[model samples]
Target: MNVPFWTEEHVRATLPERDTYGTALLLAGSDDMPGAALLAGLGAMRSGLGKLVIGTSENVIPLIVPVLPEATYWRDGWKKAADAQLEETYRAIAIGPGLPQTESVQQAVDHVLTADCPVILDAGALAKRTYPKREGPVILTPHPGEFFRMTGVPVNELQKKRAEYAKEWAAQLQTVIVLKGNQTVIAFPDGDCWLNPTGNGALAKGGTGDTLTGMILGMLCCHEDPKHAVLNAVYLHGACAELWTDEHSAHTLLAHELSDILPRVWKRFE
Candidate 1:
């Protein structure tokens, strides 16, 4: 399929195709932080990920119940880990939204590298983590700050060496890198790269990174090619910002609000 812009009509056309996908795993923050997990959990639901799993502490379950009533809780506790019977048929996995830079979290992030499903790394995963090589499909979504941490390059140099930095990371990790900024760039391990022309400052708010992860995971579940999946996500993210601009200023719309308008964005590319 050709690269299509995520427009409102295209998303509307694909509304009936939700069941075409099987499931998605959202490894968000634990109860220690509800804001990040809440946004990610809701985003996963809105993105139409068939089954959603919020990997967190047992204490967090009650906090998420009212927020995401349908989501199943996958406790990071030993009990769930010991239950090998849990199904492993996830389509995509979204990691690192609100996690801190703890040793356990780092270990978990490392384990995700071996996951058979497509992985979308964002927020905490981008900032507090490091990788030698990814054993499965991977997409690295980093904002300017996270970008600096991932590549150890200063912000000033990032603008000029954007392509080089992104390509280097993609090739080094054998995965896809979505270097986001004024103009987003998606680089693949094979050296192919696409600079996304969509998006604006309206999307510079907090929680957008979590939303980005959800969009990428949503597309990756149905779309092959980590490059294409991330490209599609970048397109939809910006498309939402564009629509938000029509009626509301960039400041008015919250990151969670993008979910309400995402179907309209997906229809354009469908």
Candidate 2:
């Protein structure tokens, strides 16, 4: 096994002045997926995080530049060459969203996980994953179906006992579980858990999860304990959505709108 380029000392020492920031996102690409990843990426940028290097499709990468001029886009066509180098820069990595279940994407996902850096697996990446071999501090953001596929526990079981199942699953995998629903459960491998006391129907809208994914990764990339990072990210994600409900006067909340409100959510905490 090749040693990963990331180290705890390397992650700790690279902290930006914000003291809550780090680099890059591996937003797994998919066929015909929109450039809307910029919306999620921008939300992360807005939350005082910095230096985003978005690895994805060529067509989608350029589309995000006008909306997010600060983002440094790396348009590689399903190549894993950058994995070793990118590991040195990224502290916490968020993967999934539109990631296709292709052989190359699986290789990329597997390659990235070998690093010591914290990881959040989501969307299609979860769909493509084998579950048994994942190593390191991983936070899997899965709805019932994705969760079921990886765990072989039915979605019906997910609704019946979210915390129980999440905890068991997390312990089995040695990872954190953020099981999203009307009453979201944040469970850890340590046998403790908490339910989110925020968010509403507006979250059912598309791409919001993607934004939340980016926010969580950005928050965790800077935390020593991955569980603590999950807690903060979950709280802030829901809190920001609640604030969006207050400020927008709009009944429907889009994923792109969440970023604009992230600063206030963080400021209120200070």
Candidate 3:
């Protein structure tokens, strides 16, 4: 089957008004990798989330506040979340980013899975595991290496058939798979798949994935359909990279700069 390209028309039709958008819970960052929390929050706030709650380490909270004061904090959220179910409701929840891949992080991931909202897993939150039956969609954003970790498919083999493996795994796990790379593929459990046409090599760096995770979380809050949200986020993240190269060289592009460039790129879609 041909995977349709999600285009500007699709994005324009699905984009939500700022006032109507909902809040999101971001469980990211740690003592050492506090930057991921800040970067993700910035991306979410900029991408049209009404309100943002960052659940990170107590110490990491202060680091993000200076840059992203609009977001509230759940102090020691990642650590506290490990022990029990999350209480507050959110439009979406994204975990991983700066967290360490450990038993404690997995505990938090377990609790988050219980929520009746869209859940996104990336970075350290991504592990070789199974997803439980849940109400909302479970979105897994993985680079090639992380995809290999989740599925036994080698990175080399998976790259050869990105859409094929992504579609297969999405059905097997009953989750949406956003396999990131040049010409990223978004595969749904229902077998529908889309290829993102935007983005460039400028995105081949760290922190870009975290920013993308935030963008998807924010878009999920704004869009009526979860599938459009994921598609638009992937498309826009790459568009930002494309925009950066219009004036600056691709070699000079930074991951965080994508967030800064989003406003203009998103407006074009609008």
Candidate 4:
């Protein structure tokens, strides 16, 4: 597998202008963990999504609105989506954050697959399953533990050859894999891959993966090519983490702060 580094030039050239950006559908958050909604929402909004619709529990809607007033609400959307297919169109859809790994969530995943746009699955949405043939890309963002859960590969084994496993699985599943770690691997189904060179220990905290998923979703909305969107999102995400460690203590960096630092980090690339 010949892999290249995704660079600032790629991101700056492929990035879409803000005015032409599109909407993103994010299905995340639960009563037990509403903070994921806020974090992912903030990430998406900050990453250049023209508009955002958070599909969460009725109660979870209010929790995010205070922090992200720019977004609209889709009350109990995950629950409703389990019963019916999504009606509206979006540039991209990202599912599973504060959600639990359950049959109902799987049902929602099935419904989401019926859409004709790029889709991202992460956290609770990461699972052992076969992907259907769809017009758009099905991207899975998984850390070591979730990657282990999804593929039954030991985390220890995966860490040794992250790109190899990521490439093999991406080809098998016919979906893109964003394998998160020290050097994140972006493996595409066509055998194309890239190693992300940014980020540090500051990104090891909780919630950062959720932020990455949202960033990818927002980038998918803005970029013309889905592949470039995924690569840029991962690159910029790690770049934000790298920026934080320059002045702030790595231990003190929070997941939301990554989104806060993204605008400046992204501008540098442009």
User: What residue pairs clash in candidate 4, if any at all?
Assistant: none
Q: Candidates 1 and 4: which is better by TM-score?
A: 4
As for lDDT, the candidate ahead, 1 or 3, is 3
Show model 3 residue runs off by greater than 4 Å.
none
lDDT of the candidates, in the order given: 0.70, 0.68, 0.90, 0.90
Instruction: Put down candidate 2 lDDT per residue, 148-191, tens digits, no spaces.
Output: 87788889867888778887887877777889887678877776
Q: 252, model 1: CA deviation in Å?
A: 1.6
Local error of candidate 2 at 207, Å?
0.7
Question: What C-alpha RMSD separates each model from the true structure?
Answer: 4.2, 7.3, 1.1, 1.1
Q: Which stretches of model 2 miss by more than 4 angstroms?
A: 1-20, 81-87, 128-136, 247-250
Q: Candidate 1, after superposition: displacement of residue 91 in Å?
A: 1.8
Worst 10 residues of 4 by lDDT: 11-20
The C-alpha local distance difference test score for the whole of candidate 2 amounts to: 0.68
**How well is each residue in 33-130 modelled by candidate 3, as lDDT tens digits?**
98899889988888778899999998898888877889999888888889999989999999999999898999999999998999999999988889
The lDDT, on a scale of 0 to 1, for candidate 4 is 0.90
